[PDB]
Write the structure tokens for this entry.
Amino acid sequence: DFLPLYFGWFLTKKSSETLRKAGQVFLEELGNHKAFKKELRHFISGEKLELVSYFGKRPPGVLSCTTKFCDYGKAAGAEEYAQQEVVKRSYGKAFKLSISALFVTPKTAGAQVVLTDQELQLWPSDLDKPSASEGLPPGSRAHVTLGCAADVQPVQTGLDLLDILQQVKGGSQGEAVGELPRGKLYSLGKGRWMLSLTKKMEVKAIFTGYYG
Ligand SMILES: Nc1ncnc2c1ncn2[C@@H]1O[C@H](CO)[C@H]2O[P@@](=O)(S)O[C@H]21
Ligand SMILES: [Cl-]
């Protein structure tokens, strides 16, 4: 009766490959783009950087969008979240996640997920939540991690996303500094980049628990 490592939406073989493939292409295009190389000094400390190798730590199997990290019940609020009706009712159910953008930072590379109202019901409201969630609506950090730097944890991907969103609401994202096939590229500075997709990418996933 102990909880899983974490709850979340796990993409199907099909959707996972599609998103992973898209993420890779983005890292290759972004790494080659001139506006990116122009700011390489703000990306790494101490040219041409292959981002695919930079984000060497990548999800082993299928991609996923985490909701509540439970650490088998050792995480705060893990017990209260798992006992919600909406969680038990939604357990094993199919969902469609809307990917609105892909982003890159010195620490992580991931995809922004925009949760619908029904999906937000499965989002945690635990006491100890990120502080970057000030003014930004709940579920704003929802994301799919695509890769991380060598000494970075995937939990950082949500934090990086919030920081990027915090900058967009302030109107400091500036105007596109380039234009990729799937959409416009934005430079937010300090090594942060955001590809806003012209057309939202829909991925199919199943809500469930991963027990490691
Ligand atoms: N202390 C923590 N708080 C919230 N999520 C955590 C966490 N430790 C790990 N995770 C997340 O649980 C999942 C597997 O560890 C990953 O999905 P993600 O990109 S949100 O970052 C990871
Ligand atoms: Cl670090």
Summary: The CA atoms of residues 107 and 124 lie 24 Å apart.
